[PDB]
Amino acid sequence: SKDELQVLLHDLELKLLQNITHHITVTGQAPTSEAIVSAVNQAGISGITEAQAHIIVNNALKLYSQDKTGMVDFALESGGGSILSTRCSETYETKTALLSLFGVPLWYFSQSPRVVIQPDIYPGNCWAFKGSQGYLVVRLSMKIYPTTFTMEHIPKTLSPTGNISSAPKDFAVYGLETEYQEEGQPLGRFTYDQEGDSLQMFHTLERPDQAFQIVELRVLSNWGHPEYTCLYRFRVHGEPIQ
């Protein structure tokens, strides 16, 4: 069926993306055209050319073009961070067309808020909530003075119409002393810029007076999508208590 098809192409793309991501993480470079030919072959399609592989790699680099820093991420799940799901907006499921590694649009499905704290970024692998206002609360792996936040979204070059209207725009960040604190300490108000890079960093105006192990992200608006907002990744940086 056409569904099974879109699924298999999605899984094929993901294999290639995981390959490329792994290689960049370890070596700091994209793999050669030849390694890509080989990975495509392992995934079950032989006879890809070098020119085709080079196109696949440049398409991948549309997404992985910033060499990101080694700033420790205390929200990252595999580092011990976790979502306090009871305090997030209700998940809203979406199906969105994005430009794939293969140059054609594919269907992608948004997921649960746990994707917000998974490593790296992958097309369509975002958490959607309904409307343009939402809440996410993350328990950090360590108690820290939070000093910097990173928000990531896919670039417009992955949209078949060069458009990311469902991306977060205005947001605010709060430190929560406990899981029940209704009103948290304001850590900052920022705006994700649809004219900026995929990965964007946001710094507190001052070093906070207090350290937190719980952080609340409030998305206050989006870039114009009438039905929902899509959040890909949120990272939390700072200094552990001494």
Supply the Cα-derived Rg of the chain in whole angstroms.
Answer: 19
Expressed in Å, this structure's resolution amounts to: 2.2
Are the CB atoms for 181 and 164 separated by under 8 Å? no
SS3 assignment, position 195: coil
Q: Which amino acid is at 65?
A: S
SS3 assignment, position 187: strand
Tell how many helices (H) and how many strands (E) occur in the chain.
Answer: 3, 11
CA atoms within 13 A on the CB side of 82: 5
The structure was resolved experimentally with X-ray
The DSSP element (H or E) to which 229 belongs, if any, is: strand 228-231
Per-residue CA distances from 179 to 55, 85, 134, 137, 213 (Å)? 47, 11, 17, 9, 10
Are the CB atoms for 118 and 79 separated by under 8 Å? no
SS3 assignment, position 188: strand
CA distance 139 to 156: 31
Give φ, ψ of 64 to 5 degrees: -105, 50
CA distance 161 to 157: 8
